[PDB]
């Protein structure tokens, strides 16, 4: 299929209407960030030659 970018939304804009939130949601979201790799070393001489 041709993917949808998102659900269509029409904001009811006018020059004298404002939307004020009467409530709130305390949301917690996760963010995963890699920090380090495995510290590896290679013995070049013994890798190439044994």
Ligand X SMILES: *[C@@H]1O[C@H](CO)[C@@H](O)[C@H](O)[C@H]1NC(C)=O
Ligand Y SMILES: *[C@@H]1O[C@H](CO)[C@@H](O[C@@H]2O[C@H](CO)[C@@H](O)[C@H](O)[C@H]2NC(C)=O)[C@H](O)[C@H]1NC(C)=O
Q: Which residues bind ligand Y (CB under 6 A)?
A: 10, 12, 19, 23, 25
What distance in Å separates the CA atoms of residue 11 and residue 19, rounded to the nearest whole number?
A: 10
What distance in Å separates the CA atoms of residue 40 and residue 31, rounded to the nearest whole number?
A: 27
User: Closest separation between CB of residue 16 and ligand X, Å?
Assistant: 4
Task: Identify what 44 binds: ligand X, ligand Y, another protein, none; CB under 5 to 8 Å per kind.
Answer: none
Give 14 or 41: the residue with its C-beta nearer to ligand Y.
Answer: 14
Please identify which residue in the block is written with the tokens 């269509």. 8
In the complex, the residues that contact ligand X under the rule CB under 6 A are 15-16
Reported residue count of the chain is 50
């Amino acid at each position: 299929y041709t993917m949808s970018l998102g659900v269509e939304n029409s904001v009811a804009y006018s020059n004298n209407s404002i939307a004020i939130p009467t409530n709130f949601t305390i949301s917690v979201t996760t963010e995963i960030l890699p920090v380090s790799m495995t510290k590896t070393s290679v013995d070049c001489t013994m890798y190439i030659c044994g």
